[PDB]
Amino acid sequence: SQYSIQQSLGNASGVAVSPINADATLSTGVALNSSLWAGIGVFARGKPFTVLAVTESNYEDVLGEPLKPSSGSQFEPIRHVYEAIQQTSGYVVRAVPDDAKFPIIMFDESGEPAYSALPYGSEIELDSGEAFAIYVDDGDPCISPTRELTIETATADSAGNERFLLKLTQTTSLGVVTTLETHTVSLAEEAKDDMGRLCYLPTALEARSKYLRAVVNEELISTAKVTNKKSLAFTGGTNGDQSKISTAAYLRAVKVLNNAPYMYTAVLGLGCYDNAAITALGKICADRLIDGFFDVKPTLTYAEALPAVEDTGLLGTDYVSCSVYHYPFSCKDKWTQSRVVFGLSGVAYAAKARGVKKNSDVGGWHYSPAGEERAVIARASIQPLYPEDTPDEEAMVKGRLNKVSVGTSGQMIIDDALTCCTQDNYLHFQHVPSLMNAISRFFVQLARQMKHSPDGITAAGLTKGMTKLLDRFVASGALVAPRDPDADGTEPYVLKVTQAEFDKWEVVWACCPTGVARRIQGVPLLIK
Amino acid sequence: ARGVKKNSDVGGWHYSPAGEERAVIARASIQPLYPEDTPDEEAMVKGRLNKVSVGTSGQMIIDDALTCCTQDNYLHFQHVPSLMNAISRFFVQLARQMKHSPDGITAAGLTKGMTKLLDRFVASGALVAPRDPDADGTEPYVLKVTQAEFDKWEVVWACCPTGVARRIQGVPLLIK
Amino acid sequence: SQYSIQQSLGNASGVAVSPINADATLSTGVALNSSLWAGIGVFARGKPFTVLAVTESNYEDVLGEPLKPSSGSQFEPIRHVYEAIQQTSGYVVRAVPDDAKFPIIMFDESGEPAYSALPYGSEIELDSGEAFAIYVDDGDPCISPTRELTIETATADSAGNERFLLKLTQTTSLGVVTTLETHTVSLAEEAKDDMGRLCYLPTALEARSKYLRAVVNEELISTAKVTNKKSLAFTGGTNGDQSKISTAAYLRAVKVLNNAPYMYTAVLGLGCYDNAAITALGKICADRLIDGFFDVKPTLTYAEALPAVEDTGLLGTDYVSCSVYHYPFSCKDKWTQSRVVFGLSGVAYAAK
């Protein structure tokens, strides 16, 4: 009939509605791209040991469905990502154990499939037979839901090369079948689609497809043929046990994250609690002039929390831009409605991103991640873990460990802005190193713009650019007049550019930061 | 049909075919076939079969709104699938109105039309705020429109239905 | 018949009435939330050593039935709570003796129940067998009335995981049976309900249920099975003797109350008469900038009442916002119609 409404779209012109689903949720958002975060973690789906991209829309697809709190303690990073995804994009890197395997389907010359599985890392090789093989690369085990392969013949090309349409479909547990995407591929070496695009199986799969890849033997492909097959499913995919992961995997993931060629101005912990991984991340953030937001295990009581920070190794005079948080509270999970406990990197980064979006010319880096306005935890029905134990403010501050407190509306907040500097100068606050690093990064951009040029124009250009940038920062309220007038003069910034030899220009600049107004002391008194 | 005529803009599809007001048998001198036999409410409900009862005026009525769904989720009631189907049909009409058009105006038109239709349905009392606020937010409907290729526009919308107040359990007690 | 009226609701669409009860009272009210009180105490029911919430409607349920003046002197806190509940909500914390125990039912692989009991505080552990166990957490001894467990099989899921419906019912002394609430749970690790909610027994019980909790062994659950059982009743629940309580329990309860993250602008004695507990409460109210409303033992005559206040240690220049009351009068109880004597914090807080 012309009044009927189908279920799944084919190739005809028409609208259709899927059956009324219940076990699914959706979210929408528009990326802002003001400051991008990054960090390693463990999840389901996603290509291992390769930097991905996460926005507020596809985070439920590229990063897979959320894990389960019951299955060990691997639910940490997805919650952390969801907390900090509502402000900007991300650059998460996934790491998997050694026993994780991905499915693979291999075809013979006659076209008979042969199911198989292989572990990650190792390349795929073909024996004397088995002309070509096709395997998934998204990393999904394909156990829930299931993905099937359907191959149907199609029309030959002008040159006579055979072409067959390849369809990948996903079957849900209930029984509903959904088609992902199809394309026309050919086993010929030079078969071209009618639109001029390539049709060779490896190139076609690696060019336009997003889920599968294929490898073709270079000696049997000339005489190899195919047939018609229906519902070829992948069997054997399994990621192993995500709870137990060796430190070597974390180190390799961190090293991969270090070499990613992208902007990211903050490195989140994202749930990793190994000391070596945290030390490597601290080495990373002190090399790109950015600021980390690591933390410690929330299950640790107040007594042993302080030695943990020293055990990390962050404490010192080198990792001056990081920060350590503790959070021994149990909230109610957003997905499973269970009593779960997770860290506090996400909320801290959310506060920092909220504070950096006020100004627009260079951004408000001089704001601290604290207070009622920006940093609000606000998960659900927060309840403490150990009511009997009580903290110690002075000792905790001595250990450079930020604390949490309670706001006006009953939602707890982040009431501290302490970095990981042992020395008691101004660089032990949070916003001062961030401001200095922002100025340094902008100067680095300016210098990179003014490189490899003949003499006579370098000095004036460098001086005027540096002065303009410092004036722009002064107008933003970041820099203020010195509190000590007679000794330091009354200039918020002081600059000096000098030349040394044929090369080796040297530029030195000074500035004064702004106050924070941390501690406030009241004192009532009766006038009788 | 008596329930769908209460509203005029989109029709009161969220009403259930039951109760004294709408569903009245009222033929003549109703008499049972086999007086000896007695029914079984729990077993009958397990089989997805609607029963009849007696109203205030002595005229029997249709005291159920059970569909033919074995799963025990929300759409095993009667009015929820009717509401979903009405929304789907109206969306199909709107999409058919906006077919075979050059690029540039499809996205905005689809978004505004879908939002207007969902708002019209919300104003009729069919959709209410979610019963679980923390996880589902406080928006009765959620919309998202995306483009896939040269063709194949995709539109996904979510909503929350309304309750029925089927079972009522009284409990008297003497204050002496 | 279509004219019949059943007694207890099942799943069919219908309206039913219960048998005419006599030994039950009800009360209604709307919370105002202008100034919330708090304070430790001793009662029946309620989760020990954890801050609860009390309004004018559920105070008969979360805090249990009122105690008896005959059974020692543990009837004070419920009277104090009732006296000060007609004005606002509350944040009472319950403390129990060391010998108080809660019932627990443990199941084997074949599905054979094994009754047991355990004292509070200590975590529950499972031996080589006994795949999983389910225990109550409300703290009720389940002696009056009695709570029974009924397990029935149900339809499997799409993945093939077995699911069984779990029903908890309460039997009154007379013989009337009332069903509390039922839910569909499964022993599988990843079994999902048809509506998307989880069905794993620990998560399912800890998420939506309000009366029971469960613990599952992580090594026998894969091959563990269940059966059909009828009327599994808890046995061995007993709170001990509430009249005698060590000062350490009161100190721990006070420390727990100090760390509760909630607004409360007044701390009440709620019948607490130990000097150390009163001193700790006084330390509490001078730290959050609030006002206490403690009192002393009403049985003391006028002569020795004055030294008692100094024995408390409240007197000084530090605990400036507190206050002490005395009430050597005997009234007629609202419930038992007997001659009882109790303190005076409730009326003072009601006036404030």
mmCIF file of C-alpha atoms in Angstrom, chain C residues 1-162:
data_model
loop_
_atom_site.group_PDB
_atom_site.id
_atom_site.type_symbol
_atom_site.label_atom_id
_atom_site.label_comp_id
_atom_site.label_asym_id
_atom_site.label_seq_id
_atom_site.Cartn_x
_atom_site.Cartn_y
_atom_site.Cartn_z
ATOM 1 C CA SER C 1 -18.102 -12.421 40.162
ATOM 2 C CA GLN C 2 -17.677 -8.862 38.913
ATOM 3 C CA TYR C 3 -19.287 -7.569 42.126
ATOM 4 C CA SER C 4 -16.767 -9.177 44.490
ATOM 5 C CA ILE C 5 -14.188 -7.019 46.266
ATOM 6 C CA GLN C 6 -10.846 -8.682 46.976
ATOM 7 C CA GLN C 7 -8.673 -7.997 50.037
ATOM 8 C CA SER C 8 -5.100 -7.434 48.810
ATOM 9 C CA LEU C 9 -4.108 -6.030 45.433
ATOM 10 C CA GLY C 10 -2.423 -8.314 42.931
ATOM 11 C CA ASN C 11 -1.758 -7.175 39.371
ATOM 12 C CA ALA C 12 -5.276 -6.958 37.929
ATOM 13 C CA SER C 13 -7.024 -3.613 37.534
ATOM 14 C CA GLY C 14 -9.312 -3.355 40.540
ATOM 15 C CA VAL C 15 -10.108 -1.574 43.781
ATOM 16 C CA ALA C 16 -10.035 -3.515 47.044
ATOM 17 C CA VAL C 17 -10.497 -2.819 50.738
ATOM 18 C CA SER C 18 -8.691 -4.424 53.649
ATOM 19 C CA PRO C 19 -10.334 -6.049 56.684
ATOM 20 C CA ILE C 20 -11.518 -3.601 59.330
ATOM 21 C CA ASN C 21 -8.479 -3.053 61.554
ATOM 22 C CA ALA C 22 -8.629 -1.780 65.126
ATOM 23 C CA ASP C 23 -5.103 -1.743 66.606
ATOM 24 C CA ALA C 24 -3.673 0.939 64.343
ATOM 25 C CA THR C 25 -3.495 4.739 64.342
ATOM 26 C CA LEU C 26 -2.566 7.255 61.657
ATOM 27 C CA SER C 27 -1.509 10.891 61.469
ATOM 28 C CA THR C 28 -1.077 13.384 58.639
ATOM 29 C CA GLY C 29 0.963 16.540 58.245
ATOM 30 C CA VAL C 30 2.957 18.700 55.857
ATOM 31 C CA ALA C 31 6.598 19.501 56.568
ATOM 32 C CA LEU C 32 7.547 23.167 56.907
ATOM 33 C CA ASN C 33 11.379 23.061 56.833
ATOM 34 C CA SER C 34 12.090 26.299 58.673
ATOM 35 C CA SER C 35 14.618 24.990 61.213
ATOM 36 C CA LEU C 36 15.644 21.334 61.385
ATOM 37 C CA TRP C 37 16.466 19.699 64.712
ATOM 38 C CA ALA C 38 18.833 16.813 65.355
ATOM 39 C CA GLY C 39 19.899 14.499 68.141
ATOM 40 C CA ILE C 40 20.914 10.971 69.120
ATOM 41 C CA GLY C 41 18.514 8.487 70.679
ATOM 42 C CA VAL C 42 17.425 4.888 71.136
ATOM 43 C CA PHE C 43 14.472 3.298 69.342
ATOM 44 C CA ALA C 44 13.229 0.204 67.552
ATOM 45 C CA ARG C 45 13.819 -0.189 63.804
ATOM 46 C CA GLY C 46 15.999 2.181 61.797
ATOM 47 C CA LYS C 47 19.514 1.742 60.481
ATOM 48 C CA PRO C 48 21.970 2.107 63.389
ATOM 49 C CA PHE C 49 24.854 4.584 63.358
ATOM 50 C CA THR C 50 23.573 6.428 60.286
ATOM 51 C CA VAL C 51 21.665 9.701 60.060
ATOM 52 C CA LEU C 52 18.029 9.242 59.051
ATOM 53 C CA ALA C 53 15.310 11.729 58.099
ATOM 54 C CA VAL C 54 12.077 12.111 60.067
ATOM 55 C CA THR C 55 8.957 14.031 59.057
ATOM 56 C CA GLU C 56 5.457 14.200 60.519
ATOM 57 C CA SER C 57 4.215 11.415 58.213
ATOM 58 C CA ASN C 58 6.820 8.622 58.197
ATOM 59 C CA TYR C 59 7.935 8.941 61.833
ATOM 60 C CA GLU C 60 5.700 5.974 62.679
ATOM 61 C CA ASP C 61 7.437 3.861 60.010
ATOM 62 C CA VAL C 62 11.142 4.734 59.806
ATOM 63 C CA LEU C 63 11.421 5.042 63.601
ATOM 64 C CA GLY C 64 9.225 2.019 64.314
ATOM 65 C CA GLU C 65 6.385 1.606 66.751
ATOM 66 C CA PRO C 66 6.632 3.372 70.130
ATOM 67 C CA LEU C 67 8.367 1.506 72.937
ATOM 68 C CA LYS C 68 6.803 0.651 76.296
ATOM 69 C CA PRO C 69 7.286 2.441 79.643
ATOM 70 C CA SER C 70 7.252 -0.942 81.391
ATOM 71 C CA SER C 71 10.385 -2.106 79.538
ATOM 72 C CA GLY C 72 12.897 0.010 81.415
ATOM 73 C CA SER C 73 13.522 3.661 80.569
ATOM 74 C CA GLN C 74 14.010 3.453 76.794
ATOM 75 C CA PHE C 75 10.668 5.129 76.000
ATOM 76 C CA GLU C 76 11.926 8.713 76.384
ATOM 77 C CA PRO C 77 13.333 9.436 72.886
ATOM 78 C CA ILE C 78 10.197 8.506 70.934
ATOM 79 C CA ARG C 79 8.064 10.752 73.148
ATOM 80 C CA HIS C 80 10.575 13.574 72.712
ATOM 81 C CA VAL C 81 10.543 13.076 68.933
ATOM 82 C CA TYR C 82 6.741 13.146 68.802
ATOM 83 C CA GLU C 83 6.647 16.285 70.948
ATOM 84 C CA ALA C 84 8.954 18.222 68.601
ATOM 85 C CA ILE C 85 7.784 16.721 65.290
ATOM 86 C CA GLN C 86 4.642 18.864 64.943
ATOM 87 C CA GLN C 87 6.793 21.839 63.914
ATOM 88 C CA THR C 88 9.444 20.663 61.423
ATOM 89 C CA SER C 89 11.495 17.709 60.193
ATOM 90 C CA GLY C 90 14.323 15.952 62.029
ATOM 91 C CA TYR C 91 17.671 14.224 61.651
ATOM 92 C CA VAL C 92 17.662 11.663 64.460
ATOM 93 C CA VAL C 93 20.513 9.143 64.748
ATOM 94 C CA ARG C 94 19.909 5.746 66.349
ATOM 95 C CA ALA C 95 22.431 3.914 68.536
ATOM 96 C CA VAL C 96 22.174 0.254 69.531
ATOM 97 C CA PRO C 97 23.949 -1.942 72.101
ATOM 98 C CA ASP C 98 26.740 -4.337 71.145
ATOM 99 C CA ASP C 99 24.627 -7.499 71.510
ATOM 100 C CA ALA C 100 21.990 -6.376 68.997
ATOM 101 C CA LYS C 101 21.735 -8.754 66.040
ATOM 102 C CA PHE C 102 19.975 -8.788 62.675
ATOM 103 C CA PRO C 103 18.611 -11.852 60.851
ATOM 104 C CA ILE C 104 20.162 -13.249 57.689
ATOM 105 C CA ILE C 105 19.122 -15.971 55.238
ATOM 106 C CA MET C 106 21.811 -17.757 53.227
ATOM 107 C CA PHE C 107 21.278 -20.004 50.205
ATOM 108 C CA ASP C 108 23.346 -22.908 48.904
ATOM 109 C CA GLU C 109 24.048 -23.789 45.270
ATOM 110 C CA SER C 110 21.121 -26.223 45.137
ATOM 111 C CA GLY C 111 18.882 -23.563 46.687
ATOM 112 C CA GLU C 112 18.448 -24.797 50.265
ATOM 113 C CA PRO C 113 17.910 -21.979 52.795
ATOM 114 C CA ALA C 114 19.896 -21.864 56.032
ATOM 115 C CA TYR C 115 18.716 -19.489 58.749
ATOM 116 C CA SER C 116 21.292 -17.492 60.697
ATOM 117 C CA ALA C 117 21.865 -14.283 62.643
ATOM 118 C CA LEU C 118 24.769 -11.864 62.974
ATOM 119 C CA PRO C 119 25.588 -8.875 65.192
ATOM 120 C CA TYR C 120 25.814 -5.363 63.812
ATOM 121 C CA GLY C 121 28.963 -3.653 62.591
ATOM 122 C CA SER C 122 30.680 -6.837 61.449
ATOM 123 C CA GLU C 123 30.611 -7.411 57.703
ATOM 124 C CA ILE C 124 29.053 -10.552 56.242
ATOM 125 C CA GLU C 125 31.379 -13.183 54.774
ATOM 126 C CA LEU C 126 30.661 -16.403 52.890
ATOM 127 C CA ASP C 127 32.409 -19.751 53.311
ATOM 128 C CA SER C 128 33.422 -22.170 50.547
ATOM 129 C CA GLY C 129 29.772 -23.015 49.865
ATOM 130 C CA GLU C 130 26.569 -21.020 50.328
ATOM 131 C CA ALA C 131 26.636 -19.170 47.005
ATOM 132 C CA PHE C 132 24.751 -16.051 48.117
ATOM 133 C CA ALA C 133 22.975 -14.670 51.177
ATOM 134 C CA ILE C 134 20.292 -12.025 51.693
ATOM 135 C CA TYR C 135 19.822 -10.087 54.935
ATOM 136 C CA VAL C 136 17.616 -7.285 56.221
ATOM 137 C CA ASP C 137 19.110 -3.868 56.965
ATOM 138 C CA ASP C 138 16.213 -1.886 58.469
ATOM 139 C CA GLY C 139 17.295 -3.269 61.847
ATOM 140 C CA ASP C 140 13.880 -4.606 62.823
ATOM 141 C CA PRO C 141 14.204 -7.910 64.739
ATOM 142 C CA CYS C 142 11.209 -9.218 62.721
ATOM 143 C CA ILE C 143 9.522 -10.707 65.789
ATOM 144 C CA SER C 144 6.432 -8.488 65.879
ATOM 145 C CA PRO C 145 5.289 -8.494 63.128
ATOM 146 C CA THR C 146 7.060 -11.175 61.065
ATOM 147 C CA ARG C 147 8.536 -10.794 57.579
ATOM 148 C CA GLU C 148 8.599 -13.727 55.157
ATOM 149 C CA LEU C 149 10.460 -14.220 51.881
ATOM 150 C CA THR C 150 8.820 -15.859 48.861
ATOM 151 C CA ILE C 151 10.746 -16.701 45.686
ATOM 152 C CA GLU C 152 9.021 -17.635 42.424
ATOM 153 C CA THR C 153 10.442 -18.293 38.976
ATOM 154 C CA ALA C 154 9.786 -15.978 36.039
ATOM 155 C CA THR C 155 10.476 -15.591 32.333
ATOM 156 C CA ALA C 156 14.049 -15.596 31.067
ATOM 157 C CA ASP C 157 15.601 -12.642 29.254
ATOM 158 C CA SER C 158 16.744 -12.202 25.660
ATOM 159 C CA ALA C 159 20.289 -13.340 26.470
ATOM 160 C CA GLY C 160 18.892 -16.427 28.217
ATOM 161 C CA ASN C 161 19.779 -15.363 31.760
ATOM 162 C CA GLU C 162 17.449 -16.851 34.351
#
